[PDB]
Amino acid sequence: SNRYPAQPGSDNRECLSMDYKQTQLCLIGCKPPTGEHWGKGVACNNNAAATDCPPLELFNSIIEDGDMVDTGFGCMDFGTLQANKSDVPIDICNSTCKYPDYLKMASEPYGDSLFFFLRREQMFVRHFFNRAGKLGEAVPDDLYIKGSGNTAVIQSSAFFPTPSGSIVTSESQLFNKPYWLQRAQGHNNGICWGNQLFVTVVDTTRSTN
Amino acid sequence: SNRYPAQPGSDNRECLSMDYKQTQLCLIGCKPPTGEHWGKGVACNNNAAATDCPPLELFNSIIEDGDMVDTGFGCMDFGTLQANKSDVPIDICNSTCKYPDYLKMASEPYGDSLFFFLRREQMFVRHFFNRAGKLGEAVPDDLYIKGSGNTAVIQSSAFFPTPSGSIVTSESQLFNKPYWLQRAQGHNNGICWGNQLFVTVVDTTRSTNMTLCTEVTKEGTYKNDNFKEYVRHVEEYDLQFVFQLCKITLTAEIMTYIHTMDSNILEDWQFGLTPPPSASLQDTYRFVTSQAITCQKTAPPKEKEDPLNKYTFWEVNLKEKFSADLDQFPLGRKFLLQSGL
Amino acid sequence: MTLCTEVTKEGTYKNDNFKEYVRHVEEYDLQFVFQLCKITLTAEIMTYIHTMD
């Protein structure tokens, strides 16, 4: 529901809390694994005198230990692309979350950053809420009919959902089993070059504190 | 619950968000496919219609690129049929949602708009809400008992359900998987005509939202009005393909079978056709801006005319991405194990 | 489905301008194939059928 109307005000934030996207995954390759993440860009030439909306770019990078996975808000920066740091929880409000680029590692010629990989993920929404700021974009008018009086003010449409992972079971366990090399995906068949390997894993079912 | 009596005033439209169907779907076919939708039609004016409801006709449209698939609120137009324009979402209210007529797609003789398809869908409904205003037809009094106090006047039964889909899992994805077609279901066994193919996909598992927070004035104390909040939405796509050339000896039994089927895959072949010789061919200039009084217009005759040019698609060039050696790709190796070679 | 037709025109929204109908639609289709079973007519056969029909 929404009983009309939205009210003016410059300060309306509060504490809430919520879970995230669940997963179980891994990857192995004798080159360190890569990963994209979205960020800003150069603006443009100043030929356009229309408005101010910022540019953007994804950024392809080999991810190291400690970096943050995307959980559904895009694989992106939270410091540069956002500006309040209050849409995001504190542990990840000051981060640049990534998503791995298995795709370009698939179109890698030899397949030396990839021997094998796993993934299992599921999701659904919990609730629907809305942002609180000036919507920079207006909505065209003839698409709807405006109301008057108490309904004269058009409320914003800066909605945002909030996630929920499903129930997990011990039958959904990925780990603690053997996964035999019999057929690799690429040209390097298990060969660790440099006598080194680059292993990764992300788990969510043992993520209590 | 919904108590009695009646409150209402002039207008009571509100703000809600909602979400929609979970799906995954695809289609392969060399001919372009159609897609049906509903819309208002012309009724008889010779009847003294005590009802004032307009009729509804199915219109078997041809699907363009970027037009809308059905969501579950009737496969109708929403511009000419939602006069309120404030009951159906804005994104679809000035558009029309579509569904495929698989059985009429099964009733094509050759089968050139369908080579293969799949669909994977799940949905359940969370909430329930109703409408207001002057409802079209009234209730017949003789199927209930009336009352008063709070139970005096009747309330509008103009309901509607709300879709909520299901969970969005990766454990039943259909992407990133090879599909080696052993045998196509119709007469066209996977052969393209006129060097073309039209494919599509609609998926909701990859449909997240990309918002944008832009502080316009730095201050260490919070104001809501520092922030011109923007939103974007991104999507990343790719395709792989493996072919097979085939030899057609143009015999008399074939050349009567195909020209009658389609003369257009003979005009690119120009066997025994007098116009494609013509004469001296097209003679170009070098581009001069002001003089050479002709312009960039299409009143010069088209070398290729079709009503598909009136529609807009995603044009994908593969006249240069061909390769004879296949093992250097992650599906060519997946083919030699599949072919046993 | 759900219909909405306005009666009047204004630049101000009121719910008492609009008329709403509701319909319910169905389509069905079929495809079959059969096979001829020829039936000879004998005395024990012709006694058997009139007991039924």
Next chain:
Amino acid sequence: AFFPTPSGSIVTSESQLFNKPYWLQRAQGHNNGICWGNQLFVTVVDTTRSTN
């Protein structure tokens, strides 16, 4: 200092692991089934039939 409330879920007759025979083809260790000391310490954990 947020904290959730754990819940669990539905329990079935198919989620049952007991009241059924077992015939182990091979024990996990170098000891392939030999008990010693004329004793053994068997343990089961079930909260599923733990209504009070």
Next chain:
Amino acid sequence: SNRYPAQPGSDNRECLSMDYKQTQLCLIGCKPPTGEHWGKGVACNNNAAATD
């Protein structure tokens, strides 16, 4: 809903209830089994006493 400000007190305890996880497992052994549990152990001798 956790809206600002607080309505605190010098006492805030209450009567609640919760449910748990669904356990069915097997465990056998003729040697006694161990468990693990976190014990409040010590650091080194002089950690500058910044935060306890």
Next chain:
Amino acid sequence: EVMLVESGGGLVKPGGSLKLSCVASGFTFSDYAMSWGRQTPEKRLEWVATISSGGVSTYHPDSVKGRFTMSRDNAKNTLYLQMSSLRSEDTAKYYCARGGGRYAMDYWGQGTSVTVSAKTTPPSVYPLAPGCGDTTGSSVTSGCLVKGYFPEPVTVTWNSGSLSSSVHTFPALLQSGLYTMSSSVTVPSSTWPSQTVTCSVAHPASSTTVDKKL
């Protein structure tokens, strides 16, 4: 049983703050609108704050813009009003409201006097009984006087409200920063003074009660 019980209104320093709480006894607090409105003397009922069914839509008039912040609790069934830097104009009697309709109000409690002033004063009570001389007439009008309280209000009840068919009680007036009042009852003379008669006067601000019987 739907009843909005007020709590938190009284004395407060000028330039200070206070916490109000309008606890509802029983209904579903998330279904219905809730509101705050006050009555100032010689003026209209003054709408202070409104809130919707869940809490989406809150508003205040031009008088309390920036100074007042409204809240609500849906589980403890309590509507709130956090105000800051109060002045002498905020001295009034305040209601909290339930909105059962298209932003329309069908409830308030008994309320509490939310008075922004300096100090309280315990009342010095004086009765008005028939004195020396013969008692005449079959009925006697008597009283009991209240002198020197600030701020409003007080209430006199005689003999636990059984004689409330004939109980009289007067309002007070502000003379030199204090209020002064009285009360009466018209009882036949079969009761007094053979059976004693008491008037009950209290004071909410000093929390000082002195009972006397005539």
Next chain:
Amino acid sequence: DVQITQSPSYLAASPGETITINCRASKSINKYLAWYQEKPGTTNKLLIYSGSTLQSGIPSRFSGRGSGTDFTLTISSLEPEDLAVYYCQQYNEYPWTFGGGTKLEIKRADAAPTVSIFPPSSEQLTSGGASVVCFLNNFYPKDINVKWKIDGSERQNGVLNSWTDQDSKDSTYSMSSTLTLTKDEYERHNSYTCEATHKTSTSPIVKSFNRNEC
């Protein structure tokens, strides 16, 4: 702002007849208008929201109508819980301003003030004040005037004027006339008389006392 005023502000009536009330508008605040009532100790009641549309539990004897800036509301067949103060209130735009208010009174047989005069008793003669109390009871209507004569000289400073309610059973009115004096002025002057005036008599109702007597 929207400045709506409520007229006529007072209604004396006998039930069964038809009684009309009005509220006029400053802006075109078209038909979004509710109506309320205040009974002390109980809750406010919404009779009709939006000018013409009815709330749960509200009966049919009410009737209200109007659009633009003109409105009319009319009531017949009254019931004894009605005696209260009634308001109109705009909510077409914030801030939600009100009408001035209309108190409904029931009409009865007229009555004269029952006058009984008292000195400040000897407990108040040692306390520090001197209030010459005199009760004027059981009259109708509210309009009276009392005259206090301090040794023939009138005093208007310190004169307190506070009228009672419509009472419970007898439904009359009373007004407090406390002559706020100090000790040396009460030492100087002996004769004090509440001289109530009413529409029953051209001669004012004069009752006196003597400290030489009692």
